Amino acid sequence: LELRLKSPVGAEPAVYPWPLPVYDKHHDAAHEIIETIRWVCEEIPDLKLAMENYVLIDYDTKSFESMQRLCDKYNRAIDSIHQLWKGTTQPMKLNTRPSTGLLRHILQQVYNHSVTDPEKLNNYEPFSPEVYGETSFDLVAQMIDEIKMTDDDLFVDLGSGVGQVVLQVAAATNCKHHYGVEKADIPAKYAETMDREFRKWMKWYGKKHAEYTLERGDFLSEEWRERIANTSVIFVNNFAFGPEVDHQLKERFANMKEGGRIVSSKPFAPLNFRINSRNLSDIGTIMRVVELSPLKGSVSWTGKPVSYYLHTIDRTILENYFSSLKNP
Ligand SMILES: CNc1ncnc2c1ncn2[C@@H]1O[C@H](CSCC[C@H](N)C(=O)O)[C@@H](O)[C@H]1O
Numbered sequence: 476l477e478l479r480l481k482s483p484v485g486a487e488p489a490v491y492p493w494p495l496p497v498y499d500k501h502h503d504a505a506h507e508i509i510e511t512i513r514w515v516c517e518e519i520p521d522l523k524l525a526m527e528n529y530v531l532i533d534y535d536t537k538s539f540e541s542m543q544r545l546c547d548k549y550n551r552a553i554d555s556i557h558q559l560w561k562g563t564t565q566p567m568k569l570n571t572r573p574s575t576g577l578l579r580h581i582l583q584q585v586y587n588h589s590v591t592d593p594e595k596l597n598n599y600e601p602f603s604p605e606v607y608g609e610t611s612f613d614l615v616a617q618m619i620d621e622i623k624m625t626d627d628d629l630f631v632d633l634g635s636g637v638g639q640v641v642l643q644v645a646a647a648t649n650c651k652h653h654y655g656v657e658k659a660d661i662p663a664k665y666a667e668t669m670d671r672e673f674r675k676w677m678k679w680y681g682k683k684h685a686e687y688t689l690e691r692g693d694f695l696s697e698e699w700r701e702r703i704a705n706t707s708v709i710f711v712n713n714f715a716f717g718p719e720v721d722h723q724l725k726e727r728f729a730n731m732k733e734g735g736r737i738v739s740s741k742p743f744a745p746l747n748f749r750i751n752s753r754n755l756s757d758i759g760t761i762m763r764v765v766e767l768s769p770l771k772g773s774v775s776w777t778g779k780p781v782s783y784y785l786h787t788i789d790r791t792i793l794e795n796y797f798s799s800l801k802n803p
Pocket residue numbers: 604605606607608609610611632633634635636637638640656657658659662692693694695712720
């Protein structure tokens with residue numbers, strides 16, 4: 476006993492067992508199904524035209540027959556569209572990036588099928604750098620919009636967790652390669668499934684994504700000193716990392732190339748930094764730090780609007796300080 480959803484591009488259908496499973500208090504397979512049909516209809520206008528006809532809310536997420544009528548109606552619409560693409564009509568353009576709305580849905584879908592037990596992500600040692608927290612989809616979307624990236628860039632999420640930041644960025648930009656490194660076994664284990672599900676679902680919807688690799692590791696290791704030095708865009712949610720880990724990271728960012736950028740939850744250098752005789756070795760001497768705009772309606776436990784910072788390796792700061800020493 477199941478429910479099947481055909482791929483708009485011919486991949487293997489999506490199969491859901493019945494009763495439909497629940498993911499958490501706010502997500503169940505039944506609504507994922509309804510939402511997937513809704514989004515494929517966004518990708519294919521003709522499909523949307525065939526779906527309107529006769530689907531007057533007459534569906535109960537709790538009735539097998541009712542949900543089966545929804546899936547079959549969608550699947551028959553998919554067959555007609557596929558016939559339509561055999562005639563003169565042009566097929567849905569392939570290998571294109573997903574829209575922001577579709578991406579939100581695809582990542583939620585991948586998460587649903589990968590993080591089977593969300594609770595285990597909380598089995599970390601409190602008050603340690605191991606503290607787990609997820610950056611909202613929207614913040615990453617904002618970062619992507621403000622930090623124009625190109626195929627010349629390399630993106631790294633230090634302490635990537637189950638890897639959803641790397642997947643969103645890989646689906647939205649054309650970096651040469653995206654990387655995510657996570658130390659804890661639990662999030663790293665889920666990242667493996669996250670990776671499989673993402674590739675599977677992106678193929679299912681017929682969407683393209685840049686190259687990316689989710690790996691297990693310690694970003695403070697020797698291998699990572701040079702890896703970090705060659706990254707042009709680094710994302711790091713260091714809110715709970717601590718002064719010791721942040722200090723090490725600074726040593727490593729100090730080797731990055733001109734124009735390199737870092738986005739984080741806690742700034743690595745004060746926003747009011749002013750070079751002088753006492754802080755010549757301070758990280759703030761080689762980087763501009765700006766606070767990204769707070770996303771409207773987005774607060775954290777601190778009651779204030781969630782804050783992220785953008786650092787840009789700019790050694791022109793230090794060079795101007797020395798010139799000022801020479802004149803006068
Ligand atoms: C000290 N060396 C280390 N090496 C590798 N991972 C580490 C680490 N220290 C802490 N972490 C990891 O950084 C993550 C921060 S939560 C942000 C998730 C995602 N990025 C999100 O934004 O949504 C945790 O999962 C830690 O295990």
